[PDB]
Amino acid sequence: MKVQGSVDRRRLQRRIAGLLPPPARRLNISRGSEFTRDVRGLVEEHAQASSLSAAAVWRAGLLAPGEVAVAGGGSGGGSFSWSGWRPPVFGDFLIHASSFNNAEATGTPLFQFKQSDPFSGVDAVFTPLSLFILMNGGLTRMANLLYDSPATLADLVPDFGRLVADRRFHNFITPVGPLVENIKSTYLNKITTVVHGPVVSKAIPRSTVKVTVPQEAFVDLDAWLSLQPCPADARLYVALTYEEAGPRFTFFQSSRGHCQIMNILRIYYSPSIMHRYAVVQPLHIEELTFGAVACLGTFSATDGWRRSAFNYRGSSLPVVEIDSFYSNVSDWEVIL
């Protein structure tokens, strides 16, 4: 009848105090002071990097129980999160060195092909320029500059003629995400790509990675069409189109919303569906399917895409680049 088995005062006094403080918001600005160490607390971004020393690592806050590094040691950890910040999940691949052209845009999207041989150590990854060559001024001048001997690629895909015939080639490809860091080796390159997270460069002097897609491929969906809403997020899409000439890859950007975008794709592809689905080729079993779309992520609307030149071998290519990309891949949807 004395005190209790699980005393409230003992637990509330110490354990509760650490969990209580939430992340600070809406600090008021004083014109007279105009700056304090208090405002630094609100602004500070608390980046996660270190010097490889026992004393510095503790200072850095890298060894934090939760997923995000938090400083102060035991005093830290009360942010409840970092603006719903999730670290980038990374993906490691082991490639042949003749497959991937070491010169790169350091952020270009990567497409992995599922080889059909079991227990295989190495995997195939294709860049947009590389993929164009396999499919068969402009890309054709730049894509061949990067990749010579198209057979070296076609070896990686021994069913390319049979899949496009049955319209199955799209579902064997899975989008992976923008390229981050590259290790060059004469025999097997080691490529690390970010899947499902805010794209961030792992270089120790920090740099801003911005995904690039060639302008010949990039189609602006919203611009092409025609008070109004303006939503924060605008998304990037891919479409694999089985055309009479051969399969093709195009990128779309729009912020309308999903149920609309499917509709937009059909009207956009209406002239090509006719020609391809026209008198020249008769309907046949298993050849009915036309295309497929997948979502690659969300890019802030009204930021836009600056157009920059890709310079290699003393010749350029017009490129569009997306800033602040947050990678979030979807599956493939058949359109027709």
Partner: protein, 49 residues
């Protein structure tokens, strides 16, 4: 002409404890400080007939 409040009354909660309750007549209470570690606990009897 006005309208008046007439008072504010709130109850006070009463607090009860196990060792205060007479039920505790049965149990014998040991504060094992670290229960989480105990995989299993045993008691053994031996009787001579």
């Amino acid at each position: 002409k006005f309208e008046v409040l007439l008072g504010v009354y709130t109850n006070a909660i009463q607090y009860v404890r196990f060792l205060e309750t007479a039920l505790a007549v049965s149990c014998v209470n040991t504060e094992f400080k670290d229960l989480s570690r105990m995989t299993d606990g045993k008691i053994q009897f031996r009787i001579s007939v």
